[PDB]
Amino acid sequence: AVVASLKPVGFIASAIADGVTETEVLLPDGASEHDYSLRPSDVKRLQNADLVVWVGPEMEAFMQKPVSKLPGAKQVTIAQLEDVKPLLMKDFNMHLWLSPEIARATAVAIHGKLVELMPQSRAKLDANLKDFEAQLASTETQVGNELAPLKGKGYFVFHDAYGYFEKQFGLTPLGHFTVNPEIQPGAQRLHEIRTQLVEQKATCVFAEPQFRPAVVESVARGTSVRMGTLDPLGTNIKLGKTSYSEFLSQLANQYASCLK
Ligand SMILES: [Zn+2]
Numbered sequence: 001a002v003v004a005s006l007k008p009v010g011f012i013a014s015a016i017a018d019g020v021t022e023t024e025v026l027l028p029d030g031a032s033e034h035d036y037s038l039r040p041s042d043v044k045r046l047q048n049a050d051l052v053v054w055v056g057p058e059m060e061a062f063m064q065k066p067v068s069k070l071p072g073a074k075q076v077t078i079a080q081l082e083d084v085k086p087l088l089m090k091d092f093n094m095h096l097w098l099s100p101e102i103a104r105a106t107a108v109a110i111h112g113k114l115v116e117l118m119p120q121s122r123a124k125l126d127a128n129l130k131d132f133e134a135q136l137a138s139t140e141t142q143v144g145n146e147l148a149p150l151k152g153k154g155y156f157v158f159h160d161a162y163g164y165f166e167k168q169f170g171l172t173p174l175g176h177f178t179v180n181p182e183i184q185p186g187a188q189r190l191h192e193i194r195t196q197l198v199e200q201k202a203t204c205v206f207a208e209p210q211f212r213p214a215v216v217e218s219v220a221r222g223t224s225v226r227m228g229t230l231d232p233l234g235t236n237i238k239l240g241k242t243s244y245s246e247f248l249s250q251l252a253n254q255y256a257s258c259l260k
Helices: 007-017 040-048 061-069 100-117 119-150 163-169 187-199 214-220 243-259
Strands: 002-004 023-025 051-054 075-077 155-159 175-178 204-207 226-229
Touching: 002 007, 007 023, 007 051, 007 100, 007 119, 007 243, 040 061, 051 061, 051 100, 075 100, 100 119, 100 163, 119 163, 119 243, 155 187, 163 243, 175 187, 175 214, 187 214, 204 214, 204 243, 214 226, 226 243
Parallel strands: 002 023, 002 051, 051 075, 155 175, 155 204, 204 226
Antiparallel strands: none
């Protein structure tokens, strides 16, 4: 199997590995990449993986050690890909699985590695990469269209996970409650967010399923601000050939459900 650190990385891997090998995901649904320790059974999967795929040590630091022990031919470290370095945005935001362009680079790297590891599967791997890129292009056209009328509407997200996606599709967030969703915002920060929401005529605040939404709801009350929910880890999406496109589509729907 290809073992992916986080579900959306698993989504990309599962487009490319479909009908070639299985894809497994380390981080369970409901858990957060900002607050995780590997289980003994997580450590097992890694040593036995045909290929490991992760963002890198500035993201999933809990994986750096066992990953450093593997051969280079048995890993893809997304944030260190030569194609990815030029695309990193300000040091750098590591929420890379939400960048369609980084997703392509990641697909390419996975394809290359699997072609080496599994030469019998070259044709299917080639076809998979082809299909992935076609589907992604359609998805980007669709998502761009869905989000176009929402450009300029201000909102707050719970944590700073969405930058690549927002930049690609022209969404205009006013800010985030937290950088690390592990760190409690503080009351001062919370009334300041509300002032900004009210003053700058924001339309939404967004909770996330991995974190209790109490604080998001508290900031909204009194105001005209609607509450939505964004899931940066695609919990409700099953791994599979079309999962990545489904993920980007669902995220777009989550923004639109509130912002429209
Ligand atoms: Zn995050």
